[PDB]
Amino acid sequence: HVETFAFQAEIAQLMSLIINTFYSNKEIFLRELISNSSDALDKIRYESLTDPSKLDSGKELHINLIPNKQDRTLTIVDTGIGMTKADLINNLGTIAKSGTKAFMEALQAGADISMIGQFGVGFYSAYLVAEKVTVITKHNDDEQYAWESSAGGSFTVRTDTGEPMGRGTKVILHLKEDQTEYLEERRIKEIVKKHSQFIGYPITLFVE
Numbered sequence: 362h363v364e365t366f367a368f369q370a371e372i373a374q375l376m377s378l379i380i381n382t383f384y385s386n387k388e389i390f391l392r393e394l395i396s397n398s399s400d401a402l403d404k405i406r407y408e409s410l411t412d413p414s415k416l417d418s419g420k421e422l423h424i425n426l427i428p429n430k431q432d433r434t435l436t437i438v439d440t441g442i443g444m445t446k447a448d449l450i451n452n453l454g455t456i457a458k459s460g461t462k463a464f465m466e467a468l469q470a471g472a473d474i475s476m477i478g479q480f481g482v483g484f485y486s487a488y489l490v491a492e493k494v495t496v497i498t499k500h501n502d503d504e505q506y507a508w509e510s511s512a513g514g515s516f517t518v519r520t521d522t523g524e525p526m527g528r529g530t531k532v533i534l535h536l537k538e539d540q541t542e543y544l545e546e547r548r549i550k551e552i553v554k555k556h557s558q559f560i561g562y563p564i565t566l567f568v569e
């Protein structure tokens with residue numbers, strides 16, 4: 362069954378700001394998410410040097426970008442460390458609470474939304490373009506979960522009965538009506554080249 366949770370007030374607040382502030386440079390969402398993926402790949406690569414059995418759920422360490430115009434989704438997939446249930450419901454939120462306070466204070470002083478990644482909370486930049494974000498994830502010592510949120514102060518988590526994914530995270534961006542540009546090959550490739558050219562894992566851009 363589906364469990365429903367309230368975001369921490371500070372996170373809810375950061376998400377409304379992301380969603381409501383006029384800010385044209387939305388494309389930065391892709392580097393923050395690819396960056397999130399790279400951090401998670403680094404994590405499993407490291408942890409595997411002292412316990413190679415952690416790669417029994419898959420050896421290949423990569424990132425796929427998968428647009429689907431029919432579904433209006435852009436999907437980022439990684440085979441990084443994945444998330445446990447406690448990560449999804451509690452730990453990540455707890456870590457992000459100071460990232461968010463800091464970021465929110467910088468934002469007067471005249472920092473802008475593109476700096477969001479320096480405060481460790483870039484994942485929420487998904488909300489610049491996605492009306493809903495669904496996240497399938499699988500950590501080595503835990504079950505596959507689906508996390509989901511359309512913002513508004515709440516998120517859901519259920520155990521995921523769908524197709525097994527080995528180990529990693531899939532971020533499914535259900536794009537807003539006027540953000541379908543991030544479904545085009547040339548647009549994605551441009552952004553990847555501009556902001557994420559030196560990521561240390563293969564990034565495959567799938568075509569439709």
Ligand SMILES: CSc1nnc(Sc2c(C)n[nH]c2C)s1
Pocket residue numbers: 394397398401439441443444449453484496508530532
């Ligand atoms: C609430 S779901 C979620 N939070 N933070 C992320 S960043 C991340 C990605 C993009 N892959 N793995 C991780 C930990 S995904």
